[PDB]
């Protein structure tokens, strides 16, 4: 029943998924061996959306694991909840991309993607009624940013009417660990805007800021960051899996969040977040949830939303509450900050309610916002890209695989056009 399959590649994508399905299995009460041990029947009624059926009553992922080197899968296999994954779904190369977009999208990708395409086609035809695809990857790496986007293009050509989600984590200029990231980042975003239906941008610097400021815990790791991202992911698809007052699917989100087909980049946030030394001192109420919703620092993106104007915003509430307080809070926040909302789209806020809170919580909030403040991140990335490109630095690697500067120029031109079209729709009045 309108199920969705999972695709992921690259080291970052694999790390994200390894904990994201841990979160999902915890929510649905599935043990690491794949046997149901839940408490309520609702945790089992809609199990088919994520988990298939196997002999003995156990459940197996409809997830696909891809990469050019075996280290990441070797690591993910031995981790907790690693026994769920079917060994067939693993597809791995013996060479590695080496942080090279050209290698990951032209040379090794062309012959390796056939097997993963066959696997995903079989998985898609297996389900009775496919709903859409979700991709989770990083655009600073080589293997992800190349083969994942080539697969996105192929799947777009094969399945036109379906919806695609892209949890894109993009390197930021502050916490930078690779030198050739601007090139493959620009190439990936140019190829990605052409096919992706929805994009959610995630910044590691923003996540570090969240952990340092809100959680106030001294020494987090990549695990905690992956946990935050996984909670954000599980939030958006909750209403599809559990009953609620107002039903909402990803197609409804796209319709209410896409004013124009070229404007499909969002910034996401989660509430509530609080340190362990301050948990006893906070009362969970709709006012607190909605004020932490719209706080600028809480966002998972480097873009400051108060530098621009929101085009659309969406909210998914989890838990039991009445519609009145949610509606009046939305009205209140739209009234008090009219300057931060565009004027020719009245009532630019969408709400949904699901009555099943996350395990160990009573109320929760997921926010997805489409605003014009995202353009600054693209502006900085393009600045770095052109600064490196005027001197033709590190270009011989990319030219060594049939690539030339034609696609460089057209990609940067398309990206500048995208920035200009965000600026235009922000600076326009009736």
């Amino acid at each position: 029943m309108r199920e969705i399959v999972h695709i992921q590649g690259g080291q970052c994508g694999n790390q994200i998924g390894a904990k994201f399905w841990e979160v999902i299995s915890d929510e649905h009460g599935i043990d690491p061996t794949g046997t149901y041990h839940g408490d309520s029947d609702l945790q089992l009624e809609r199990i088919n959306v994520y988990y298939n059926e196997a002999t003995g009553g156990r459940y197996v992922p409809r997830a696909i694991l891809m990469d050019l080197e075996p280290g990441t899968m070797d690591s993910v296999r031995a981790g907790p909840f690693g026994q769920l994954f079917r060994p067939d779904n693993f597809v791995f190369g013996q060479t590695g991309a080496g942080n090279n977009w050209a290698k990951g999208h032209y040379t090794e990708g062309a012959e390796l993607i056939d097997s993963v395409l066959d696997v995903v086609r079989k998985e898609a035809e297996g389900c009775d009624c496919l709903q859409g695809f979700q991709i989770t990857h990083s655009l600073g790496g080589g293997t992800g940013s190349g083969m994942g986007t080539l697969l996105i293009s192929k799947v777009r050509e094969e399945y036109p009417d379906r919806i695609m989600e892209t949890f894109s984590v993009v390197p930021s200029p502050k916490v930078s660990d690779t030198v050739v990231e601007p090139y493959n980042a620009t190439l990936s975003v140019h190829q990605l805007v052409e096919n992706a239906d929805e994009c959610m941008v995630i910044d590691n610097e923003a996540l570090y800021d969240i952990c340092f400021r809100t959680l106030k815990l001294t020494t987090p790791t990549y695990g905690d960051l992956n946990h935050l991202v996984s909670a954000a992911m599980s939030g958006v698809t909750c209403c599809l899996r559990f009953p609620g007052q107002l039903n909402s699917d990803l197609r409804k989100l796209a319709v209410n969040l896409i004013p124009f087909p070229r404007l499909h980049f969002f910034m996401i946030g989660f509430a509530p977040l609080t340190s362990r030394g301050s948990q006893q001192y906070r009362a969970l109420t709709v006012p607190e949830l909605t004020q932490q919703m719209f706080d600028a620092k809480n966002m998972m993106c480097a873009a400051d939303p108060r530098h621009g104007r929101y085009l659309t915003a969406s909210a998914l509430f989890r838990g039991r509450m009445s519609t009145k307080e949610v509606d009046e809070q939305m009205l209140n926040v739209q009234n008090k900050n009219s300057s931060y909302f565009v004027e020719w789209i009245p009532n630019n806020i969408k709400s949904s309610i699901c009555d099943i809170p996350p395990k160990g919580l009573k109320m929760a909030v997921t926010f997805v916002g489409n605003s014009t403040a995202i353009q600054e991140m693209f502006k900085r990335v393009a600045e770095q890209f052109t600064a490196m490109f005027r001197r033709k630095a590190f270009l011989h690697w990319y030219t060594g695989e049939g690539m030339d500067e034609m696609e460089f120029t057209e990609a940067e031109s398309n990206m500048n056009d995208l920035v200009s079209e965000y600026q235009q729709y922000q600076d326009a009045t009736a």
């Binding site: 075996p70 070797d74 791995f92 815990l217 001294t218 946990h227 977040l273 362990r276 006893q280």
Partner: protein
């Protein structure tokens, strides 16, 4: 803002010197309870830290070990649950079955 000094002589017992109030000052006896409870709590673990004042700093915190359902159960930190030995060869790869292939199939 004070010494809590309690001693038999009244000029320096505070509780005797704070008794002029119309009521009992909830503070003196609260500190009495904190001291006696701290002694018992230290008895459970075993610290004998040359004086009771050292552990009284952190025997009073009400912070629970786990979360109380107002934040994500991210725990206290993955790094907190880490233990480190330093013998050579502890962090070598394992090559599980999924990546453990031999035969390199000949045909497609």
């Amino acid at each position: 803002a004070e010494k809590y000094k309690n001693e038999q002589e009244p000029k320096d017992n505070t509780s005797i010197q704070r008794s002029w109030l119309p009521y009992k000052d909830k503070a003196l006896q609260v500190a009495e309870n904190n001291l006696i409870k701290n002694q018992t709590l230290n008895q459970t673990k075993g610290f004998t830290p040359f004086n009771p004042l050292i552990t009284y700093k952190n025997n009073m915190s009400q912070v629970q070990q786990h979360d109380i359902a107002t934040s994500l159960p991210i725990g206290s930190g993955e790094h907190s649950d880490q233990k480190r030995t330093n013998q050579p060869g502890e962090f070598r790869h394992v090559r599980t079955d999924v990546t453990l292939i031999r035969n390199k199939p000949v045909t497609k």
